[PDB]
Structure formats: structure tokens, C-alpha cells
Design a protein around this ligand. Structure first.
Ligand SMILES: CC(=O)OCC[N+](C)(C)C
Ligand SMILES: CC(=O)OCC[N+](C)(C)C
Ligand SMILES: [Ca+2]
Lengths: 304, 316
């Protein structure tokens, strides 16, 4: 039908705007940490006098990280890990705690905000080499192993980490520190799922007057956000969504919308896969809207 | 017969709502792409300000030389192919004594030592630097209605990010629209300088041309109008980019743009000229930009569609 087509084109356009709004949120941390990687690699790149182009101390690099946290309130944190002896001699820094160094001197700072909002630092010695499987299906060290192994940017699916006495679910945005063809380390920043969820909830309230719900699904099919119920974050979409929805989640092409009508529940399903910057990472936005909210004007024309 | 009017009004609403949603989608896509240069230059500003912000020891948090700051700018160009350039300018004696660096323009300094590097790519793609001494203090008006130094004066005056209305630029034997994206280097409450990068806006022309094909077999036009009234994009004709929008649109409509409200759509049915227009003002981040997307549809296309929709209702 021609009228159905005009209504459905409105729906797709509204969904596409929700995707580009989410991309703005998710591409931002990647560009932040690209900036830090593009600066830090100058520690290892000679200049016209044969000395490093950046001769910054560890205290100065940490200042850059802390300034990132300070002036990027949307980011949960900023962190960086060097390979053993990547840019200096770790042994000179061994036995110095509370600076983000491992016990052997390896540079591993994780900067985030304490209770008063002031930045504090934790060394990632415990997680950087950990093969522990977290309950969301993510290994504890994947924020570093993935950029080390693939030598390109990595976005990690939702995972819980302990932060100042509480468990925080988060996704990390990671870039390798490359000098030539050599992996020297990686730098990253997290977004909390609570942050992404709050934004998706607010965005949903402006979509068809809030009649429906949205789900953001990571590369492993687990929920980054789910406007109906915060308790489902991190959980598999296959343990929260419909048989029909879970099937449609398998029916998707690489980057192309899937439209479906769940008559059993009287709502429209729209799945839009999308990629995050040039990282090649593909997540999915799901819109679930009551049929009456989308087709109310048709209902009104036919009703009279 | 009032049933006919109520029915026609509801069909027109469905049509108008589709066009509004299409407009909002172009705005959202434009905002996604144009955050990128702001994030890059925010990173450079947030590093450079540490030259003047003390630590607990009372001493600055970053003890970097001018050469090291320039290396950060050079690395930005090298590692962001989409950016045309990256440039930074300090206030006189902002972080050191300019006079100690006088007489060395080959490093991006002014003649009396002011730090003014502009880094771009030479013919072989390797970055090279030039001093901005000839532009940094110039309030000469460009055709676009901005000062030659707007990229610096606007962040100095407003102490927040500034996106300068685009200027034409030759790229690959074609003229494209180019804007700079600028942020202040703030130490406490003090403006110390600014850092920016230029980005081509050709992707907007391409975006809007593709979107304009979705509706009415491409019979409409889409435009993006800057605050100076000039065309950032115009799907009908690449040759019009950078021209006053009043050359393709009723002049008083263009004069009216300053009165519109951000994110509020506005329809104008110009029955005299047989076109309907939808305007959608928008901004970018905290830059305070005032840009307007415009969708123009011929009345004959809409009328024909309404007849088809009524025909489908009749046949029900
Ligand atoms: C416990 C720990 O060190 O976590 C580090 C990983 N990160 C920054 C992604 C949370
Ligand atoms: C080439 C070009 O875009 O001119 C503007 C350069 N700027 C803004 C650094 C002075
Ligand atoms: Ca369903």
C-alpha cells in the first residue's frame, strides 16, 4: 500500500537518526584515544636531531591521561598499558605503587574519578594478563590482548570490572600504540553501560512519544542498553527477546535494515546493524514500537 | 465534504511527517561526522593547556618545548588523513617569552616569536609548516562575511568551540566547501590560544544528493544554509556551492532564517512559486553554530502523491 509506504519511510528515517546519534556517542571515545596514541607514539619516534620527538616522563604521560578524564566528563576513565620496556626500562620503576605501575615497573595506569570527582589511578597489573572469563562472556584481558593480537582498534563487548568498591559494567574503546610495525602498547577509554542506557532512554522518550523501546546489541549479541529494563544489561539478547526477534537477529545482513511485524504482540520490529567509525566493529539497534503508535493515522483514516 | 477536508489534512500530515523525519536524519548524520574534528582539536587543547596548569608540586604538569607541541600537531596531520591541516596559535607570551624565539619563521613562528604554526601536507604527502603571521591579526573580510582571523578571534571572544562558515577550496579539480573547527586553549579563566583543523564538507553534498533521490524521483532540492546565508550544500547544482542562498530561494525566506529556533521544523507553502519548503535549523555540539537544512518539493509532486493516496482510500 502507498500510505503504508509513506508511514514506513518515516519509521526508517527515525531509526536511522537513532543510529547516527548512537554512532556519535560510540565514535567519540575512539577518536579521543586515537589522539592519545598519536601523541604517545612520539616517545618512540626520532626527530631531526635523532632524539625522541616527545621526551615526556611517565608523570607527563599520566598528566595527559588524567587531563582526558578531567575534561571529558562523558568518559568513564582513560587508561594505557605499555609492553614490557616499550619506551623506558621498567626495572627503574619497580616497587613504586600508586602511580599506575605494575610491581615490576610496567606502565599500566587506569585513571578514573573518585567519590569527590577527583582523578585517581590504579595499576592494571591484575587484569592485563588475566585469562579470567567474566560472566558476560568476555575475557578480563581482552581490552589489551585484542589490540596486541590484531594491531588495530578494538571495541570490547560489555564486561564488569571493580571500580572503587563497586562492580561497573562497561565497554572499552581501544587503540594500539604503534611505532612502525611494532606494537608498543595500547590506550583506551570506557563508557559505562549506565551512561549509554540513560541516553537511549532519553532518546526513546522522543520517539513516537515514547510508545516503544529500543535495544542496543553488541557484537556477541549481548545487551549494551535496553530501555525497558536496566536489569538486563550485559545479559544475551536471546535470554530477553522473542523467538521471532532472536530469529530476525540471525536474519540480518551485514549492514541493511530488517523490518518485521510481530502480530502475537502487535508491535513492529526494526533491526539496523551499523559500524563504529572505521573500526569494522558492527553492533545492532533494535526498535520495538506498538503497531498502533506507528500506524495511528492509518487507524484514524480507516476508523472514519 | 468536511470529511474530505479532514481526510486530506490527515494525508498531508502523514506526508509532512515523513519529510520532517528525513530532514532530522540528515541533521543527525551531519552532527555525527562533524563531532570528529572537534574531538581531535579538543585533545590537542587538553594536552597543551597543561603547559600552564600546575601540579601539586606547584610546577606545570607538562614541560614540553615548542618543538614537542609542534610534533603533536604534525602527528595529527600524519594520522588523520581526512583533516586537511592542523594549526595552533598562542597569545603573545602565553606560555614563554616570544622574544627568545624571534626571527625564525621557518618553525611556524611570527617574526617577533609568537607561536603560530600551520601544519599541512606537501605535494608528496609529508607534513610541512608555515607561520600564520599574515593572518592571525587580520580582520579583513572574506567574501563569506567572516574575518580572515575568525578561526582565532571567535574562540578568543567566546571562549568556546567555533566552527567557521565554509569557504570554497580547490580539491581534485573541483571546488569544495571547507570549514575550520576550532577550540580555545584555556588556562583557568584565561584564553591562551586556540587550535583548529580544516575539514572538507564535500561529504554533505554527497549525502544530501543521495537522500534527495529517495523522494519524488529526485524532483525536490535539498540545501544546507550557513548563518551567512550561503550554500554549504545544494543538491541541484554543485556550481552553486558557496553562493548566497537567496539566489535559489525567495530573499525574505533567507532573511527569516535568523529568527528560527534550533531543532524546530518549519513548513512554508509558497503557492506563488509552486514549491513547498521545509526548514530545519540545527547546531553542532557546543559550538553555537546556526545552520539550516532546507527541503524544497514542487507542489505538483505533492499534489500528485495526495491524489494517489486518496485513490487508494477510495478503492478501499
Ligand atoms: C581491573 C582493571 O585493571 O581493569 C582494567 C581494564 N579496564 C580499564 C578496561 C577496566
Ligand atoms: C587552506 C585553508 O583552508 O585556509 C585556512 C587556513 N587556516 C584556517 C589555518 C588559516
Ligand atoms: Ca516481537
Amino acid at each position: 500500500g502507498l500510505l503504508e509506504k509513506v508511514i514506513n519511510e518515516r519509521l526508517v528515517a527515525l531509526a536511522r537518526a537513532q543510529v547516527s546519534q548512537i554512532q556519535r556517542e560510540l565514535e567519540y571515545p575512539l577518536t579521543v584515544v586515537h589522539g592519545l596514541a598519536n601523541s604517545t607514539r612520539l616517545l618512540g619516534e626520532p626527530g631531526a636531531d635523532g632524539m625522541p620527538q616527545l621526551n615526556a616522563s611517565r608523570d607527563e604521560i599520566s598528566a595527559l591521561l588524567r587531563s582526558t578524564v578531567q575534561n571529558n566528563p562523558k568518559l568513564l576513565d582513560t587508561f594505557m598499558a605499555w609492553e614490557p620496556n616499550a619506551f623506558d626500562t621498567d626495572a627503574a620503576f619497580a616497587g613504586q605503587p600508586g602511580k599506575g605501575y605494575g610491581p615490576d615497573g610496567r606502565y599500566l595506569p587506569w585513571w578514573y574519578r573518585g567519590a569527590d570527582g577527583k582523578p585517581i589511578v590504579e595499576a592494571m597489573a591484575d587484569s592485563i594478563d588475566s585469562e579470567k572469563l567474566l560472566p558476560t562472556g568476555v575475557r578480563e584481558n581482552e581490552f589489551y590482548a585484542c589490540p596486541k593480537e590484531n594491531k588495530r582498534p578494538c571495541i570490547i563487548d560489555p564486561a564488569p570490572y571493580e571500580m572503587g568498591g563497586k562492580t561497573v559494567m562497561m565497554s572499552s574503546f581501544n587503540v594500539p600504540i604503534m611505532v612502525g610495525d611494532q606494537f608498543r602498547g595500547a590506550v583506551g577509554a570506557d563508557l559505562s553501560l549506565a551512561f549509554i542506557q540513560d541516553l537511549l532512554k532519553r532518546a526513546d522518550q522522543q520517539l513516537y512519544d515514547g510508545a516503544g523501546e529500543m535495544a542496543l546489541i553488541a557484537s556477541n549479541g549481548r545487551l549494551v542498553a535496553y530501555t525497558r529494563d536496566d536489569s538486563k544489561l550485559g545479559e544475551p539478547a536471546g535470554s530477553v527477546l522473542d523467538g521471532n526477534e532472536v530469529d530476525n537477529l540471525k536474519n540480518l545482513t551485514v549492514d541493511q535494515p530488517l523490518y518485521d511485524i510481530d502480530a502475537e504482540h502487535g508491535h513492529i520490529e526494526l533491526f539496523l546493524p551499523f559500524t563504529i567509525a572505521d573500526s569494522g566493529v558492527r553492533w545492532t539497534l533494535m526498535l520495538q514500537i506498538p503497531q498502533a503508535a506507528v500506524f495511528g493515522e492509518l487507524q484514524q483514516l480507516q476508523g472514519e
